[PDB]
Curated annotation (Swiss-Prot):
Purpose of the protein: Key enzyme in folate metabolism. Catalyzes an essential reaction for de novo glycine and purine synthesis, and for DNA precursor synthesis.
Recorded superkingdom: Bacteria
Protein species of origin: Staphylococcus aureus
Gene designation per UniProt: folA
EC number of this enzyme: 1.5.1.3
Protein name (Swiss-Prot/TrEMBL): Dihydrofolate reductase
Length: 157
């Protein structure tokens, strides 16, 4: 299976100045639960903003840089390489990879952040006419998670 994994706000903002505009620990645990034991594919800027590979799963970075070699990271240089990765593969970001892959993935795990943040990078527009809602779960709010959010699993019709 080839899936998108993304958190975007009410206007589809995903990032600002190579960081996330929000901090939402529940969403990072969502990422950890979905992706532990599988594969993440991310663009070079997304990788550099995380700084290190995420533990207990395969980290694949797409870059044109043939000098890229990071301990604990597999490197690919073409979109077509993604289709050779075995197992459950999550397209992890950022804007460039989401734009390149949204028409190719089987399904999307989207966290809708119910706020309007300042952004400079966006998830591409999509319509529910193309996507069935396999599940929709409101995130629980607490002291450490103060922004309303919803976990959507969307499957291509
Ligand atoms: N909210 C979320 O769910 C989420 C998730 C992830 C990231 N983000 C945010 O998204 C933003 C980054 O997005 P972005 O679009 O600027 O960057 P990005 O997609 O993370 O990385 C772009 C880079 O990926 C490489 N790349 C992409 N397509 C390629 C291809 N077809 N062939 C070879 N290399 C390719 C290139 O690297 P080279 O230039 O090295 O060749 C390109 O410069 C940040 O703000 C980050 O915080 C948000
Ligand atoms: C900046 N970044 C990219 C990022 C952030 N939120 C997302 N949220 C969703 N839904 N999808 C993504 N693609 C996504 N990507 C990050 C930053 C930190 C960690 C991280 O430390 N995750 C730990 C969990 C951290 C924790 O337990 O609090 C993990 O094991 O995956 C993940 C991605």
């Amino acid at each position: 299976t080839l899936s998108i994994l993304v958190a975007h706000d009410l206007q589809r903002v995903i990032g600002f100045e190579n960081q996330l505009p929000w901090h939402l620990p529940n969403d990072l645990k969502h990422v950890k639960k979905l992706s532990t034991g599988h594969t993440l594919v991310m663009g070079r800027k997304t990788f550099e903003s995380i700084g290190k590979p995420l533990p207990n799963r395969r980290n694949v970075v797409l870059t044109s840089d043939t000098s890229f070699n990071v301990e604990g990271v597999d490197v690919i240089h073409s979109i077509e390489d993604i289709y050779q990765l075995p197992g459950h593969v999550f397209i992890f970001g950022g804007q460039t990879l989401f734009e390149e892959m949204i028409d190719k993935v089987d399904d999307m795990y989207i966290t809708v952040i119910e706020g309007k943040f300042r952004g400079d990078t966006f998830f591409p527009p999509y319509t529910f006419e193309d996507w069935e809602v396999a599940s929709s779960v409101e995130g629980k709010l607490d002291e450490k998670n103060t922004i309303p959010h919803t976990f959507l699993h969307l499957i291509r019709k």
